Design a protein around this ligand. Structure first.
Ligand SMILES: [Cl-]
Ligand SMILES: [Cl-]
Ligand SMILES: [Cl-]
Ligand SMILES: [Cl-]
Ligand SMILES: [Cl-]
Lengths: 490, 491
């Protein structure tokens, strides 16, 4: 077993991964053996070879800035500037769901490390009055739409829920889901699968040991999505369920319209093989990727790749030229997703960033470098746009659809902001449905008072502000106001 | 003299302000008598009459949402959508400055109560590397323009600084300015004056006693600006200084472009007598009043007065219909302002608002009520757009021009970290746009968009991002980074 690993490491020029073999406890060494026997060394060498020949190849080419073109008018639909077309699209979305032809695919992360937390993000509770986690909010949205679809089409239906997770976080996410009785969905319609990993490598392409017996690993990027789908036969599953369309999104957006039937409807009606939802970027320095065309191909340019000039460029109308802010919310046809998984994905190389990788040295001290000593390779989910034959963009309102949980409260994209955004939305819903909020003396608060008016509507009651006139129309409320399966509460 | 008041308060139905007289230390009597003798009763009832013949009157009228139309495109200028125009407006601005035809008019408030401090906002150190106060940052923008305007027209020139402040904060602000030798400016060119004040009223227009010997007093709002100018002849002082244009602005915005020549230039070119700078409101629930017309009359509708429906209305272009977010930044002709002060402001009545006024009960006790018991009367700066013969509106970018200091440093917007970041980010950009570059510990350059990259440039060096090429073009820096009268420094 070990002289077959040896042979393979040698073939790959990675002999040094057993540097410390003769210093390990039998248990430590058949813990490291496991890790290595899993990896494919021939392939990783290829990945590295091809990826370096770009981080030093297109590195003698034009800065992306000059190759960049804005989204064409002809391609984008707008939640705002396309009125009561929304209706037609909503209906098309619910018809699709109704016929069991839609599924959601969730990029759950791994651990809430940036968050300061050991549990995966989305078991995070941002301190909503209901204190539901992101998982639960999202489950309830799936479930709400299976109710609203049955209401408008009379047929009982399901959105199967594919959830991708890091290998650390699987059994826990499963246990969390099992403990909560899948929040009312059926175990059968929740499918957990695991992201792959890539090792950190030296500039010279030597795989790096984090410890005498751990190789320095990290996820392969959001774009590891596709390789993971193949590995776990996720597509065969979707086909045998008879699924046509996948909504793809990330766990961290608390406002996320899971399986948004407007988006799905849009994309279905326009026969798109691929759509990306976006919010309008209005501040040049906003840390957000822009959807755009590079050398004529659709993709996202990350926010840390653009010149301040590019960012500050303004179209005729006063807006930013590159204003299609990417929120990691996508539509895929199954057929197009299947060709990306079985054909177009391998047809890619990895993105390469220089990283300061901590490693164990010859003498066994854990060093922490102060210049970068190696690279991480990542694939991005939005890299496949280039293969869409008919790609669309759908512009939504930030405050209705996007407020991500990225940081701890130590200034933006944190629990306070996420929470404030969901409560402001739901506040507005009540006003939009005829409701009013009222202070202790019972005189009514203005719609824009100024702490923040606390409001929370279970998704089971309203997916996106519908279904509330019965609860709130011409009634006044003292916040905190909650609306759930047992009605309103003050 | 003490008997006059009895009759004076009798002849206004305010006799109850001596309610506790017989109980007071006669030191407490001097105190109250002093407070009371200097007031114009009759005027205060008259205000309360004319201000209540309207908080009742509009009562039985259409809501403000049905009488609101946007600013017409013909009136609106824009830093984004209008280009070589900007260099043109700029140089007109400078020339006006350079012929000494320009003053500024600062609304400092009173104490930074909302901010959790006993001093006015002008003195707030948002915690920049230079630890400069707002007052300083502003003063030094007045100096820089003087220098810039002179390099561009020959003549040396001044931009007088009329500072309005609360009666409390006056002598603290003079002490502060003196402590700092007027930040570089001459003391002859800083002219301070005091905001007046109004007492709280019961719903019956009876003046309210906060304690046995204290009338419950408040500021008369920004709009007292006008009355405040008349009292201390501030108009004549400008007329005889030979000033034509006034840039009027409030103190709490760290990015404010004091006497901005672009905005002045626009207003002069368009021949406006009145101008409001504004920034694009894009989020319906942003608490920022909007400039617009109500019954075809120009004014500001405050964010607290509109329905959500109005806030969420949208023009064909996908933008908010009412997107002219008002940043308390205006341009006045003196003639106009002269007329506003002497003639038009007295024509107005006061805005009325129920409040919970701490008052003293006849059973001695000092009560802070839970229900609102009386009213504040106020006036606003923007109440007088309607009298302008030519109103104009100038849109600018938020990130360059507007970041206000409103709340104490929570984990919350519009506060010290916010303000601090906005100025840093702005200057960080100023550097990149002048060919500068930024560098980690190891020396590889870091992206235009990455704590935040700390960068502070003295108004002395650069007002709005000009003159940096001298210091930063094709050059690579390591932050924190200060550029300063005495060179660049990597701190
Ligand atoms: Cl192998
Ligand atoms: Cl839990
Ligand atoms: Cl809160
Ligand atoms: Cl009610
Ligand atoms: Cl009198």
């Amino acid at each position: 077993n070990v002289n077959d690993l040896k042979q393979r490491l040698s073939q790959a020029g990675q002999e040094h991964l057993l540097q410390f073999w003769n210093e390990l406890s039998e248990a430590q060494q058949m813990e490291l053996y496991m890790e290595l026997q899993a990896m494919n060394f021939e392939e990783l060498n290829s990945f590295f070879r091809k990826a370096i020949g770009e981080f030093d190849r297109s590195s003698h080419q034009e800065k992306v800035d000059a190759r960049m073109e804005p989204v064409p008018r002809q391609v984008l639909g707008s939640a705002t500037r396309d009125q009561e077309q929304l209706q037609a699209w909503e209906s098309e979305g619910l018809s699709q769901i109704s016929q069991n032809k839609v599924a959601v695919l969730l990029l759950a992360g791994g651990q809430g490390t940036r968050l300061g937390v050991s549990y995966p993000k989305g078991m995070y509770d941002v301190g909503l009055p209901s204190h539901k986690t992101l998982f639960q909010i999202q489950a309830e949205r799936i479930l709400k739409l299976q109710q609203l679809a049955e209401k408008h089409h009379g047929n009982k239906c399901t959105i199967p829920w594919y959830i991708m997770t890091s290998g650390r976080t699987m059994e826990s996410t499963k246990e969390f889901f099992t403990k909560h009785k899948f929040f009312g969905l059926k175990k059968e319609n929740v499918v957990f699968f695991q992201q792959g990993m890539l090792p950190a490598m030296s500039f010279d392409g030597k795989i790096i040991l984090e410890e005498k017996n751990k190789v320095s690993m990290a996820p392969d990027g959001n774009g590891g999505l596709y390789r993971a789908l193949a590995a776990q036969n996720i597509v065969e599953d979707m086909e045998q369920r008879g699924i046509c369309s996948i909504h793809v999104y990330c766990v961290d957006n608390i406002l996320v319209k899971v399986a948004d039937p407007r988006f799905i409807g849009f994309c279905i009606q326009k026969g798109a093989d691929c759509g990306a939802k976006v919010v309008e970027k209005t501040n040049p320095t906003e840390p957000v990727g822009v959807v755009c065309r590079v050398d004529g191909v659709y993709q996202v340019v990350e926010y840390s790749e653009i010149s301040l000039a590019t960012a500050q460029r303004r179209s005729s109308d006063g807006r930013l030229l590159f204003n299609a802010g990417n929120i990691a919310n996508h539509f895929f046809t199954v057929p197009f997703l299947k060709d990306v998984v079985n054909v177009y994905e391998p047809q890619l190389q990895h993105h390469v960033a220089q990283k300061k990788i901590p490693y164990v040295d010859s003498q066994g001290y854990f060093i922490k470098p102060d210049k970068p000593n190696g690279i991480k390779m990542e694939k991005f989910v939005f890299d496949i746009f280039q293969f869409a034959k008919k790609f669309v963009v759908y512009e939504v309102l930030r405050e209705d659809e996007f407020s991500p949980l990225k940081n701890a409260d130590s200034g933006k994209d944190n629990p306070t902001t996420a929470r404030h955004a969901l409560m402001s939305l739901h506040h507005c819903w009540v006003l939009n449905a005829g409701g009013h909020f009222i202070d202790e003396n019972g005189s009514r608060l203005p719609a824009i008072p100024r702490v923040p008016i606390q409001c929370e509507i279970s998704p089971l009651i309203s997916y996106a502000g519908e279904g509330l006139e019965g609860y709130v129309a011409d009634k006044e409320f003292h916040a905190p106001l909650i609306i759930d399966e047992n009605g309103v509460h003050e």
